Amino acid sequence: MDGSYAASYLPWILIPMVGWLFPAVTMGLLFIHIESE
Amino acid sequence: DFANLTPCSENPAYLAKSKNFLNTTNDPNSGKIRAERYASALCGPEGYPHLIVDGRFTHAGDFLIPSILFLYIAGWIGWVGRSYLIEIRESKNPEMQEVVINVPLAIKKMLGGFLWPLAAVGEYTSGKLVMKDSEIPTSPR
Amino acid sequence: TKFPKFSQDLAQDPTTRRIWYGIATAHDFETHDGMTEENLYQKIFASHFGHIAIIFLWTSGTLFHVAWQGNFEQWIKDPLNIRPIAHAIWDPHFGEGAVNAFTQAGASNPVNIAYSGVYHWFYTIGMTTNQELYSGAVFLLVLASLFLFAGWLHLQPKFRPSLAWFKNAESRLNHHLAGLFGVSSLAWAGHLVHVAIPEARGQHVGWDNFLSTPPHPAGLMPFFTGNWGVYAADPDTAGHIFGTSEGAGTAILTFLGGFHPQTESLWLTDIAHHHLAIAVIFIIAGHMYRTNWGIGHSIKEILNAHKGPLTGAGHTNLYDTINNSLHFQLGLALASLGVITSLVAQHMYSLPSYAFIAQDHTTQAALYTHHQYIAGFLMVGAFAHGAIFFVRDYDPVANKDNVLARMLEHKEALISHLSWVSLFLGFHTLGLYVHNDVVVAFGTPEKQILIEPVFAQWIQATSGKALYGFDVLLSNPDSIASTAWPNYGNVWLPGWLDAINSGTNSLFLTIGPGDFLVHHAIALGLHTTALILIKGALDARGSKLMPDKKDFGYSFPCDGPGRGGTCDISAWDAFYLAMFWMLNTLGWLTFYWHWKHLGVWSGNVAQFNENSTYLMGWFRDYLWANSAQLINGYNPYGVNNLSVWAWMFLFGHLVWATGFMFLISWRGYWQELIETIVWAHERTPLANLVRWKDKPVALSIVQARLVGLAHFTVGYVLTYAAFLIASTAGKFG
Amino acid sequence: ALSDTQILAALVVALLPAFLAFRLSTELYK
Amino acid sequence: LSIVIFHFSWKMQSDVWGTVSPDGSVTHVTLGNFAQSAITINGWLRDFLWAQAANVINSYGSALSAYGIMFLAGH
Amino acid sequence: LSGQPPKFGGSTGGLLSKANREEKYAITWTSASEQVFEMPTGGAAIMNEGENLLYLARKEQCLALGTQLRTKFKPKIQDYKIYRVYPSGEVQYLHPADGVFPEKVNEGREAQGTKTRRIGQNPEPVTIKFSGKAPYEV
Amino acid sequence: MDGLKSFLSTAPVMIMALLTFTAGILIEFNRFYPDLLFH
Amino acid sequence: SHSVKIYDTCIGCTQCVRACPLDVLEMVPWDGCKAAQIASSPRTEDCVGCKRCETACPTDFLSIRVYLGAETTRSMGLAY
Amino acid sequence: FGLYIHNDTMRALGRPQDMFSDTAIQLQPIFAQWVQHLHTLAPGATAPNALATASYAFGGETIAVAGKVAMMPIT
Ligand code: CLA
Ligand code: CLA
Ligand code: CLA
Ligand SMILES: CC1=C(/C=C/C(C)=C/C=C/C(C)=C/C=C/C=C(C)/C=C/C=C(C)/C=C/C2=C(C)CCCC2(C)C)C(C)(C)CCC1
C-alpha cells in the first residue's frame, strides 16, 4: 500500500483508528452504557 | 404490418431447420408433416414459429380457437363440480360425500356439462349463480 | 436497565431481549414513554435534519474521494478509455498479488473502479478540475453543518414548532411545490444555462467570470420583450464535441429531442429547457392552496366535495385521516417515491443524460439495478406503512362509508381477485416456460410457445419505431400525430425519430418472444407481492382466524398453537413474505435487463432472442456462461481485478444461507440449546468468574424472522451486485 | 492533482459537522 | 451427505478415475484438481459445481436431456 | 419447609445460580406409599414415606411435578404445597393460595382480570393515541 | 361387494382413475396427431 | 408481566384454569352463566404467555385473552 | 470451515503462501497416512496368507482394465 495521492500517511493512521479505535471505543462505551444502572 | 416476421415458407433459417426436424412419434414422416404444418405460420430470424394473440382472425387459430376450446372444456369442469357440490348439500351428511364420491350422481352431473353455458346464463338470470353479499359468511371488516 | 430509556417496559427484563428490542424500538417514536403528539413531531423534525446531514456528508465523501484519490483530471481527457477510480484501497491484508492486481486505471496505489457513475455526472454538470470537486466537498460539509445546527436549533424550546405548524398541509404543499420543487428546478436550469452548457461548449464559467460572461450573446432583454426565439437560434450542431468548441451553437434553450451524437446522451440545452418548463409548471402549482391570504384552495373542501353515488361518503373526512396519521403520510410518500425511483431507473437507461454513460456499461447496469432495488424496497415500505396505519391510526368511526371504509368493507373480494390473477398468470408463465424447456430438451425447439408481444411492439410503433411494420401514429408520417396539423410544433420529432430508429442506443429496445414471457413473470411478481402486501394491509385489523389484531399491534409473533396454529398471522409477517417476493421480482427483472443488455452491448442479440424462451437457456447462457469470468477472479494460478467481486459473490452466498438458518429453524430449539450452554458456563472452573448481567436468551420469533430477512436481503444484494458488476466489467472494460 | 494541506483543511472543516452532529444527537437523546 | 458425495465424486474424478495410456501413464477426469482447488470454497464452486455441470446443462437435444430437465426440476 | 428430600441421585438438570441469587421454588407433598416419580429436571426419584421437600428453580417445574403427582398416581397426592423461597430467607406460599385448587369455586375469591365486555367492544388504538396505554387496558 | 364399491368410489381412487383417463386420451391424441402448435 | 383478561362470554367450563401450567387462573363465582362461575386471573404475574388457556377455550371467539407484554424473570421461564 | 474461509480469503488477497495448501502451511492427515501405510504393508507381515492388498485404495498398483482405471491409491 503505497500512496501516490496527497497525504498518504493519513490512511496509514486512519485505517487503524476507524478499524480498531472507533470499534473498540464505541463498543466499550456502548457496553458501559447499555449495562449501566 | 409484421415486417419483422417473415412466413416460414420464404425463410432461410426455417428451411435450414426443417431439413432436420426430428420424429416425435413412431412414424418416420412426423417431422415432414410437422415441417409442412408449421410452414404456414409466422416465424422470426431464429426459425421458430411465433403465435399472434391480437385476436386478428387471420391468426385466429393461433390463440382464439384454443381459447374457446379450453373455456368450453373447463367451464364443463367448473360447472359439473359446482352442480355436484350444490347437489350433495341436502343429503344430511354433505361432508362424507366429498370423501366417497357418489358415482351415479357424479356421472349424471359429468354428462350434464354439455349445456353449461346455457345453464350458466339460466342460473345467472334466475339468481342461483351468485349469492348476496350479506348472505355469505365474511371476515370482520 | 438504563439503555432503552424510551420504554420502561424494556428496562426491566434481565435478558438480552432488551438490547435487541431497544435497538429495534429506538426509532418508533410513537411508542416511547412520555410522548405527546407535539414532542413526536418535533423529534421527527430534528431526526429529518440529522438525516439531511447524513445525505450531505455522504455526497461530500463521494466528492472528496473522487477529488483526492480519484483520477478525475485524467478521466476527462478520454472518458472512453480510462476507468474512473472511486477511492483507494488501504488494507494491511493485501499480498503482493492483490496489490499488483488492484493497481488499475492508471494509478500507483491499489484503487477501486467507480461504478456509481458520479464521474459522468460531475463531467456533465460542468465540473472539470479537482479543485472544483474539493470546493464542492467543503461546501457540502458546511451545508451538512448548517442542517445539523438547524436540527439542534429546532430542539430548543424557543424554536420548537407548535402542532399547528406541523399540521399545516396547505402551506407546506405551497412551499414544497413552488419553493422546493420549482425554485430548485429553476436554479438547476440556471446552473445548466450558466455553467454546464457553456463548459460543455468549451468556455470556463467559474465563480469569477460568472457575472462577467452572459450565457447568451443576447442579454435578458430578449427574455423580457417576449422575443424568446433567440435563445433557440443556432442549436448544437450534430458534429459537436463535448468539452470544447466545434460547432457549439450558443443556444441555451433548445428542444431537438434526440440524442447528442457524440456523448450518446441528451443535449444539455434540452435538459435546461426541460427544467425551465418544469420549474414554471411547479411554481404555478404551488399557488394552489390557501394560506394567510385569501386566494387558493382548502383541501378539506376539495376532498369533501367529491361524493358520488357509487361510493356514498366519497372522500369525506379524509383530510383529518391523512393529516393526523403519520403512517398514512409515510405510506403515500414511500409509494410515490418508489414509483418515481422505478421511473428514474427505467428512464436513465433508455434516455441517459450524462456524458459517455451510455458507453460505460457497468455503471449503467449498477445504476439501473440500484434504483430498481431501492424502488422495490420503497414500495414494500409504502405497503408496510399502509398496514401500520390500518393498525394504529385508522379510525373506523370518522372514516365511515368513505373510500377507506369501503376498502376494508370488501377486502375479501379484491384479495381473492389478486389471488386469481397471480395464480392464473403464474400457472401459465411457468407452464409456458416448462413447455418450452421440455420441448427444447426433447430436441424439437420448433414446438415452443413463442408469443409475439404485439401490444408492446405496437406501443413502440406509436412512439415512432418503424421496425415492426406498423404505421399507426408516429411510424406513419402522414398521420395526425406525426404532422401535428394545426401548428406543426413537433420540433422534437426529427431528432426523436432519428434516435428511436438507431439500433445502438437502449431507447425502445427491440422486443421479441423472449420478452413477452419475462414481462408476464414480472407482472406475476408484482401481483403476488401486491397480494401479500395488501393481504397484510387489509387484514391488519383482523381476519376470522384472529378478529382482534389491532390490540396486539403490528409485529406480534403469533397467537399460539390454538385455532389450528397461528404462526405468521401479524401484518408484519405479510411484510416479511412480500419482502421475499419483492427480492424475487427484482431479481427477475434485473436478470432480464442484464441479459437483454448483454445481448445489446455485445451485438449478439440472437443469444437472448433464441435462448431466453426456456429456463435452461436462462441457466446456461446467463447464469453459467457469465459467471465464468467471476469465479476465476482468484484461482490457484493468480489474482486479477475481479477478485473482490468473486469474494463478495461467495460472501453473499454465505449470508443468504445463514438467512436460511434463521428462517427455517425456530426459537424452541435454540432456547434449549442456549440453556445447555448456560449450564456449561455456570458449571465450569475459571469461567464461573465471568457472569452475564443480561441473561442469554434466544432471539425472539419476530426478531429472528427480521434477522433472517436481513440476511436473505444482504446476501441476495451482495451476490447480485458482485455478479452484475463483474460480468459486465469482465467483458466491457 | 490535489494538495497535501487541502486534505487537512477538509479534515479541520469537517471537525465542525462532527461537533454539531454530536450536539444534535445529544439534544435528540433528550 | 451432500458434502460426502461431493468429496467422493471430486476425489475419484481427480485422483482415481481416468484413462491409462498403454505407455503406463494415467490421466484423470478432472486432472488433479482436488489437491489445490478443494481447499477454498471458490475452488468447489468453480472447479466442481460450475465446471462439472457443463455436462448437465449443455445436454439439451440429446439422450442426456432428461437429466437436464431433472436438474432444473430439482431446483 | 419441613420434609426430608427425595432419594435422588443428583443431576445436571436442576438449580443454577438463579436459585441462590433470586427465588427458587419448593414443592412439599405427603404420601403414605414409597414409589417412583419423574422429576421434571430429568430422571426418576424416590418418594419418601410421609413428607417430601423438593427444591426446583422454576414455578412451571413445580406445577408440572404437582400435575404428575395428581394424575399419574392411583392414590392421588393432592395435599401438595408449592412455596417460593428467597435466598434472603423468607418463604412465600403460592399454588394452593386459597384452600382449594383453582379449578373449584371457593366462593370467596375476587374476580380480577375480568373485563365487562367481549372482545368486540374492546377499544381501538386510534382513540388511545399517545396515551401511554394499550387497547386492552383501557 | 359394496365395500369395493365404496372403496373404488373414494377420492384418491376416483381422482387417479380420472387423471389416468385424461392422461390416456391426451397421450393417444399425441400418438395419432403428434405436433399441434396451433390450428 | 402478561395480562390475562376474561370477557363476558365465559361459560364457566373450567377448561382454561386446568389447561394453565402455572395455574395463574382460578374460578370465581359469577351470576352471568348457567355454570355460575367465571375464570379470573389473580396471579397473573406468573403468566409465561404459553396461551394454553386460549387454546382450551370453547367459546367463539375467545372468552380469555393473553396480551404479551413486559417480560420479567417469572414471565420468561428462565431457570438461570 | 474456518480453514476453508481462511484459504479462500488468502487466495483472494494474493497470499498463496499463507494458505492451508500442500505447498503452504500443511495439515497432513498423519494418522490416516499411517493407517494406509499399515494396510499397504499388511499382506506380507500382518496378513501372511493374503497375496495382495485388501484394496488398492490404500496403496499398491493402479489397476487398469479396458484402458480405464479400476482402482489406484487414494493419496
Ligand atoms: C478494519 C480494520 C482492520 C485493520 C486495520 C486490520 C489490520 C491488521 N490485521 Mg486484521 N482483521 C480485522 C480487521 C482489521 N485488521 C477483522 C475484522 C478480522 C476478522 C475477520 C481480522 C483478522 C485478522 C487476523 C486473524 C490477523 C489480522 C492481522 C492483521 C495485521 C497484519 C500485520 C500484523 O502483524 O499486525 C500486527 C498487529 C498490530 C499492528 C495490532 C496493533 C498492536 C500494536 C502493538 C500497536 C499498538 C500500539 C500501542 C501498544 C498502543 C498505542 C495506543 C495509541 C493511543 C497511541 C494488520 C495490522 C494479522 C495479525 O498479525 O494480527 C495480529 C492476523 O493474524 N487480522
Ligand atoms: C369444481 C369446484 C370448483 C369450482 C367451480 C371453483 C371455482 C372457482 N375457483 Mg376454485 N378451487 C377448487 C374447486 C373449485 N373452484 C378446489 C378443489 C381448489 C383447491 C386447490 C380451489 C382453489 C382455488 C383457489 C386457490 C382460487 C380459486 C378461485 C376460483 C374462481 C376462479 C376459477 C379459478 O381460478 O379456478 C382455479 C382452480 C384451481 C386452482 C383448482 C381447480 C381444481 C379442479 C380442477 C376443479 C375441480 C375440482 C373437483 C375435481 C370437481 C369435482 C367433480 C365432481 C364430478 C365430483 C372460481 C370462483 C380463485 C378465486 O379466488 O377467484 C376469484 C382462486 O384464487 N379456487
Ligand atoms: C420554499 C421553502 C421551503 C423549502 C425549500 C423547504 C425544504 C425542505 N423542507 Mg420544508 N417547509 C416549508 C418550507 C420549505 N421547505 C414550510 C413553509 C413548511 C411549514 C408548513 C415546511 C415544513 C416542513 C417539515 C415539517 C419538513 C420539511 C422538510 C423539508 C426538506 C424536504 C425536502 C428533502 O429533504 O428532500 C429534498 C427534495 C428535493 C430537493 C426535491 C425532491 C426530489 C424530486 C422528486 C425530484 C427528483 C430528483 C430529480 C429526478 C433528479 C435529482 C438527481 C440528482 C440529485 C443527481 C427540505 C429541506 C422535512 C425535512 O427534511 O426537515 C428537515 C420536514 O420534516 N419542511
Ligand atoms: C398510503 C396508504 C396506502 C397506499 C399505498 C399503496 C397502495 C400505494 C400503491 C399505489 C400505487 C403505487 C399506485 C400507482 C399508480 C399508478 C398510476 C398513477 C398509473 C397511471 C399512469 C398514468 C395515468 C399514465 C398514463 C399515460 C401513459 C401510460 C402514456 C403517456 C400518456 C399518459 C401520461 C396519459 C394504503 C391504501 C395501503 C393504506 C393507507 C395508507
Ligand SMILES: CC1=C(/C=C/C(C)=C/C=C/C(C)=C\C=C\C=C(C)\C=C\C=C(C)\C=C\C2=C(C)CCCC2(C)C)C(C)(C)CCC1
Ligand atoms: C378477446 C381477446 C383478448 C382480450 C381479452 C379481454 C380483454 C377479455 C376480458 C374479459 C374480462 C375482463 C372478463 C371478466 C370477467 C368477469 C367476471 C364476473 C367473470 C365471470 C365468472 C363467473 C361468473 C364464473 C362462473 C363459472 C362459470 C361461468 C363456469 C364454470 C364455473 C364457474 C362458477 C366458475 C386478447 C387480446 C387477450 C386475446 C385475443 C382475444
Ligand SMILES: CC1=C(C/C=C(\C)CCC[C@H](C)CCC[C@H](C)CCCC(C)C)C(=O)c2ccccc2C1=O
Ligand atoms: C441461530 C439462531 C439463534 C441463536 C442466535 C443467538 C443466540 C444470537 C446470535 C447473535 C450471536 C451472538 C452472533 C452475533 C454476531 C452478529 C454479527 C450480530 C452483531 C450484533 C448486531 C447488533 C449487529 C436464535 O436464537 C433463533 C431464534 C429464533 C429463530 C431462529 C434462531 C436462530 O437461527
Ligand code: SF4
Ligand atoms: S410455532 Fe411459534 S409462531 Fe407458530 S404458533 Fe407456535 S409459538 Fe407461535
Ligand code: SF4
Ligand atoms: S376456558 Fe374460556 S369459557 Fe371455559 S372457563 Fe375458561 S374463559 Fe370461560
